[PDB]
């Protein structure tokens, strides 16, 4: 497990990053599916996309693993407040806070288990 996701809101589960790639979204074809019943009643759930974002680890140019967050949502995926932007991707460092739809709507904290 190279990384772990800590859920900061009810309705979401924690996640241990084992595989090289994870999709987060309402769609059922997502490794991480926003579907906890409790959550489907919160209205914010309605602003999350079918395919909201993904987290993956990839061998970069320097021949070393690198973590990335790639945004695919309609309302936005934010890292430490900053919009990633639809279709765009960005490296994901340890202690990064992930917010959905609204830049302050924290949902996850990303912990890089590579230094640990």
């Amino acid at each position: 497990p190279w990384a772990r996701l800590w859920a900061l809101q009810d309705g979401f589960a924690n996640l241990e990053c084992v595989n090289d790639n994870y999709w987060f979204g309402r769609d059922k074809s997502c490794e991480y599916c926003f579907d906890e019943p409790l959550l489907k009643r919160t209205d914010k759930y309605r602003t999350y996309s079918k395919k909201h974002f993904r987290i993956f680890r990839e061998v970069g140019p320097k021949n070393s693993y690198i973590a990335y967050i790639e945004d695919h949502s309609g309302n936005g995926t934010f890292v430490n407040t900053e919009l990633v932007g639809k279709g765009k991707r960005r490296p994901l460092n340890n202690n990064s806070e992930i917010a959905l739809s609204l830049s302050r709507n924290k949902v996850f904290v990303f912990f890089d288990l590579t230094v640990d």
């Binding site: 309402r26 602003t47 309302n75 609204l102």
Partner: peptide, 8 residues
């Protein structure tokens, strides 16, 4: 799945 409520 339902279409996403766009907040803008």
């Amino acid at each position: 799945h339902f279409d996403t409520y766009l907040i803008r």
